[PDB]
Amino acid sequence: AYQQGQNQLYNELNL
Amino acid sequence: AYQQGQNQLYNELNLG
Amino acid sequence: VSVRPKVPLRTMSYKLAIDMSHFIKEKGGLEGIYYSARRHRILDIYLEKEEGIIPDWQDYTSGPGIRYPKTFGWLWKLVPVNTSQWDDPWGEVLAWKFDPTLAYTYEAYVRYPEEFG
Amino acid sequence: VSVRPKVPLRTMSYKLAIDMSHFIKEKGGLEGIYYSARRHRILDIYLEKEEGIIPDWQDYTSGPGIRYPKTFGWLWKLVPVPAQTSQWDDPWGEVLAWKFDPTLAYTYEAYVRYPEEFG
Structure with a gap:
């Protein structure tokens, strides 16, 4: 769930 | 001798 | 997706900053x-977990107005558009903007040299 | 004379390069x-013993022609102006000479002209 919630954040940067 | 040597080198660049 | 590997830490150099800027840009x-x-x-x-960049590089000028990158090489600046505790102190709405000029122009230091010690 | 005391080391920065550029010129x-x-x-x-600057700043574009500083803020470039050859001679066989240019402060000419020499 760690390296998955990180992707949630990255998307806010369109990354 | 060490300081005088380096100053000799500097003079080539017009320094010291 | 599957768990992905760690990345060897490293400080963001100029070339590394240029590369990371474009990479993200593209x-x-x-x-x-x-x-x-x-x-x-x-x-x-992101740049730490994905590229191993040590988080001591992302520093901008205080403001107001355009916030220029304190690290030479980084090609992304903060520009005003047109409450939260993540909000800008200057009460300005900021947005990211790619500036290629910043590859050979130290806008940050030439405009606000006093913000450097 | 009197032995000049050691100067505490420091890595050349943009402003430091600017300062040293003008200082040397003057x-x-x-x-x-x-x-x-x-x-x-x-x-x-010189800059190491007298100003304590780490000797890792003075890098120039490979050439030929004008050699631009690979340290932004260093306002000294190399400009072309030989009997027997010296092993200290330029590989391009060009005679080069130091030339001051304050313009080098506001444009990173090196990267602008030869982006390939970075990395």
Whole structure:
């Protein structure tokens, strides 16, 4: 769930 | 001798 | 997806800053995105977890107005558009914007040299 | 004379390069002086012993022609102006000379012209 919630954040940067 | 040597080198660049 | 490997830490150099700037640029990230103290950290973690960059590089000029990168090489600045505790102190709405000029122009230091010690 | 005491080391920065550029110029150094790999090093020592600057800043574009500084803020470039060859001579067989240029402060000419020499 760690390296998955990180992707949630990255998307806010369109990354 | 060490300081005088380096100053000799500097003079080539017009320094010291 | 599957758990991905760690990346060997390293400080962001000029060339590394140029490379990271374009890489992200070509990905379609950052550009036009609204900025906040929160999303600022997200980026620190991104280049750290994805590229191993030590989070001591992302420093901008205080403001107001355009916020220029304190690290020479980084090609992303903060520009005003047109409450939260991640909000800009100057009460300005900020957004990321790619500036190629910043590859050979130290806008940050030439405009606000006093913000450097 | 008196032995000059050691100066605490520091890595050259943008402002430091600016300062040292003007400082050296105002003393009458470098300008119009024939560059060589040997004298290149004399410049490293000078700034190290006298200003404590780490000798890792003085890098130039490979050439030929004008050699631009790979440290932004360093306002000294190399400009072309030979009997028997010296092993301190330029690989392009060009005679180079130091030339001051304050323009080098506001444009990173090196990266602008030869982006490939970075990395």
